[PDB]
Design a protein around this nucleic acid. Sequence first.
RNA 1: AAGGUAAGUAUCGUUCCA
RNA 2: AGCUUUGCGCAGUGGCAGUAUCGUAGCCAAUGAGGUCUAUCCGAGGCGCGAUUAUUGCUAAU
RNA 3: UGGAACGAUACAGAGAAGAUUAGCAUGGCCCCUGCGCAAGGAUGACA
Lengths: 85, 141, 81, 49, 61, 124, 178, 146, 49, 54, 98, 33, 146
Amino acid sequence: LGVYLTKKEQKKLRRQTRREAQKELQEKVRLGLMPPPEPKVRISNLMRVLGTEAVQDPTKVEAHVRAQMAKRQKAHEEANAARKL
Amino acid sequence: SYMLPHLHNGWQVDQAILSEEDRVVVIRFGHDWDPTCMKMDEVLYSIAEKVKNFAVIYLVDITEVPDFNKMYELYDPCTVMFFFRNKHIMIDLGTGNNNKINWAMEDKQEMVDIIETVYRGARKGRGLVVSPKDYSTKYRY
Amino acid sequence: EYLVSPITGEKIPASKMQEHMRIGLLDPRWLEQRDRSIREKQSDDEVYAPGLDIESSLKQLAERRTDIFGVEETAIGKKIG
Amino acid sequence: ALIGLMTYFREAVVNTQELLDLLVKCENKIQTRIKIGLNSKMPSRFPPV
Amino acid sequence: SERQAEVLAEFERRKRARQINVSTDDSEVKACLRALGEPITLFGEGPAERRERLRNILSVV
Amino acid sequence: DVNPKAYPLADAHLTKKLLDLVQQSCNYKQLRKGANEATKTLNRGISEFIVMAADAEPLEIILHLPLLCEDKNVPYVFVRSKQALGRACGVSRPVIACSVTIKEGSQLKQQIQSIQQSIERLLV
Amino acid sequence: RSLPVEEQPKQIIVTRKGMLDPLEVHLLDFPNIVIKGSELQLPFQACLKVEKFGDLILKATEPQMVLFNLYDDWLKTISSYTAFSRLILILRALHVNNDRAKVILKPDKTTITEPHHIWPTLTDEEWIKVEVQLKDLILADYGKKNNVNVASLTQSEIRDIILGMEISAPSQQRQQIA
Amino acid sequence: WDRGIPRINTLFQKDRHTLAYDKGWRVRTDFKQYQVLKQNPFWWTHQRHDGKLWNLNNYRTDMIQALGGVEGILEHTLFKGTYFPTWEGLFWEKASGFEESMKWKKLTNAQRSGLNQIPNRRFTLWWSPTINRANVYVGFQVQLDL
Amino acid sequence: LPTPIENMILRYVKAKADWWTNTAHYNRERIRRGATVDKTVCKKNLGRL
Amino acid sequence: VDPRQTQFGRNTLMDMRLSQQTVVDPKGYLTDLNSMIPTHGGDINDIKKARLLL
Amino acid sequence: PPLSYKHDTKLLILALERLKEAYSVKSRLNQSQREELGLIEQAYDNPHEALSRIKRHLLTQRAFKEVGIEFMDLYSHLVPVYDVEPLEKITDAYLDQY
Amino acid sequence: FLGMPAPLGYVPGLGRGATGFTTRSDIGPARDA
Amino acid sequence: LRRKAARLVAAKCTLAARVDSFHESTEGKVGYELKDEIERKFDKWQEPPPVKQVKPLPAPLDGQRKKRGGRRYRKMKERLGLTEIRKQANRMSFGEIEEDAYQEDLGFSLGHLGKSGSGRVRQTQVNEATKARISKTLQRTLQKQS
RNA sequence: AAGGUAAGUAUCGUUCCA
RNA sequence: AGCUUUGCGCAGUGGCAGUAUCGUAGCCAAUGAGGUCUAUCCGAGGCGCGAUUAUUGCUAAU
RNA sequence: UGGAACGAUACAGAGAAGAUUAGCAUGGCCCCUGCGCAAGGAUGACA
């Protein structure tokens, strides 16, 4: 029968998996199979990131950041739906 | 003194100046038996490992190598010369002579200070660097 | 005796499962620091002289400083007197 | 340092001539230190201003 | 203007090999190597890089 | 098997349930690992049952635990490998003895009572 | 002193530098209130040129203070950080000129505007279009005034123009540092 | 005002209440030498409990009077070169923004040694018309190359 | 360590320690008497003391 | 100084504004009390300018 | 020092002010200095818990961490300078004031 | 490199194009050239 | 090492005691094994420290290096930024004698901070980002001690 | 007598010297 | 049928700290790591070394 | 013709100290939420 590895190696293995995924993603992006990650922006970061470009057309910029928020939330919700039993 | 690498003939010191590009060559010309030269050939011992990244120290006995006495004025008992990429780096002290440190000092921090200042001014591409401390006196009082 | 590996799900000997868990989770980035500093010291060049050079320099220094070495005292820079 | 003792030793300083000489000597030492800090060669004169 | 690039093949073989089971036992390591024919070790090839070489070799077959 | 001096030695059927209970008590902070801590719990009277391993070569280092359980009327049972018990307890090092203590309104009361019942009918 | 403590302003910006001085005396009892001057020629003197705004003050027999709300219902569907930007763009455009600004502000013939709110009632995409039109108007006015093609003005100086930054070179002969 | 060994101005001091509960302060001030590295010249007293027992406003007044006043001192300085219309409405920037930022950065001791003497250069410049003089520093002169 | 090497190293340590003590006390005498000494000399002498 | 203590031991303002389909929201003019001597004081820097202002 | 003392905070205030006088004139701070100032300012922020800690230290603490030593040279004699653990300095100062 | 005999035809100094200095007239020998 | 040795020797003592209670290994094989383990731990504790390399000082830095920036860099700039009270203290006026504050150490003048020469009419409010803060491990020690 | 050399890149002249 | 507990995963939102995170084919460790209160009690990791912009990446200017 | 030594003008001259500063995401802790896995509790139900 199997054995139950302890919480220390639980955290260690989780860290290995996440670092593995991050490095693989970064190597793929350096290759260019996906575009470089666009900076995740919120309402609080709206004028920090895009403010200079957000002065000219503020409503377009807030629409774009809210679209990014909606895309993230939709990715989460449909990820749960795909993982739904 | 005896621990640091030694150069025996004229060709070796010129090669040691030429065989390096990314550090500073600090040559202690003099006689390792001199009370003056032995005073600072232990300071150069105590910091040889510390300055390995940007400095290499060779020792030369002018009697063993009587080829640079006339050209570089090797007549003070002890002399220190800094070379960078086959270029003698002049250094401005408080003393009148601005080509050498012709006296043996005592503090292991000030010599690393001078060597690092020489390296910093030599990466830029200068020929004369300026020491932090002033040696127009001895700060004794 | 057979156990099941918690990480790979494969039959393993019960005697090894301890060091199996010690080593199967060996952190991958550890390998470079094991294989990086050793290369640095392999390519590193010495700072002090070889021991024979210290011996020879000590002999040469003893040749001059008769106020310490030898039995026939002479001047500081003189070979013998 | 000067007012550390001078406000402490007030009237005694007048009667201690050697203390006055030491005070003047030390002030001259401070001035000499500053002048050497300016340039290596000490000046012939140097204004109090 | 042609592709002339198999570097994506290098990334895909790396990511497949990273998900390839390798025994944590040097004995098994060397048993599998003798099964395929690879040497026990190279000059100055310790155990961690022995396992890594085993992984890199069974990435193909 | 390996050690004849194994009275309550359990087989590979309820060992899985025992290790599951050990892990759950670990998640609930409801065990004391180690022979010394098991003995302290037995002395304090708050130990409900202790599980040891038949792989400790000088078994008499832990053969006082069944006697202490007999004194305190506490269920006790063995396993077949110290490494499995140690890893199940929540630590990497091989453990040869662990204890399960009490908790008010514990969610593990039913399972711990079932384990006590199962062991108590296995002595003979 | 009127507003409750949680509604007391923690930062007062001032358009005209002369006002920096009096506030610090009338804010002498509020040391935690930071009074910051503005180099930004920020368009609020034109806020009084709106029809629903001026009309109240052009005819009033006695002095009193009244409250408004320059965000009609935008905060129902947009963040305040872009509500302020929309307001400032609209006010810069209105400062540029009133009539063409009104014509832009009424793209639809209906252009419903009840006395409950102030600005015309448009939804998000018409706000996109009107903001683009107002930006084009402001850059066009700046180009006409300073005789520079609008395209050459990159986004940084576009933001400078909108907020109230513009520089000149009267000391052009003081270039001897080069 | 400013008279009496426990100076009368101490009575109006802000923390007068809490200094009422400060007893044996002079003894601990004396023993401060064993806890702090640098010796205190004013170990014998404490400015809070009996006030400073000396005044230098008259001393500075007389020093300015004897040195020739603002114009009698500024003639020695480089003030007239700066060409300020008057000496009022000025402040001294005791720390340049660049060097005060460098003060906290990770600096090797070589840079820090040559950085603490930046205030010694603006001092030399501010008194250059006096230090760089023919009467003082007797000897030959050399002009700058450019 | 061999006992002859250890004996020689003990003798070295004893001799250097005797010189160290004597030099530290002599430098302290120089400093207290008012002689002219260096800053690093004072630092090293304070460490030795 | 406290007479029991021995050697060994602000900007008032009359105006006041009341908070609360019509955009126009006029507010009443309220007059306030007087200000006595406050314990808080001396929160002023650069007196030679503030005195000139007043 | 009782649990309910009228002058309890006054002595703590004086002790904290005295401990901060050593840093009152300062431009740059080391790590230990930063931690010390943090300790005094935290004890100022929460006087009750700090004083409870002080009472517990006075009542049941008898094992202390090593206190560093150095010497300041007057060129006539050497004055020893002792560095004490930053948390215990507060307790010692409050005890001294009381 | 270290531990090698000097070349027979090598100029002992200045072969690297070095330039000597004369800090003062007294120090050194006569130029004699 | 005695305490650390006392724990180990008592542990092996009870390991031998449990053996002797039931009268096994009467010839002392387990006792000799435990003594061997104790001696191995003892001479492992007394083993001299190994060879530790003296790393050289880092080389002087080059011209420029790219750096990251975000919330962490913003907080670093806030902690090390010139607080208005700090920047107001650096300014030191001009031609305005002031009474020497802090008797115990003069040369400590606050400059325009609290000065009638120039500055804001309101007092320069104290900042909160520069408040002294304790370390995480030290606060952990505080939690455990209480 | 000092502690007071900015370090360089150029063509041109001269001279010894290989 | 829901309710609900706990651990482990995947993501999401938000807060907080950058004098700290991380490695351990180095060693020891519940057969006891480590002990200042309280010790016939406590009782889990510790040490040494290495990486470091006091975790690490891109994008972005200069 | 080699190089050295050497005398001229011509040129530059800041001989200034600086791994510079912005955004996001990872990583650390904590809280909340969704979803899954391993289980496990209390409980609803007349005919």
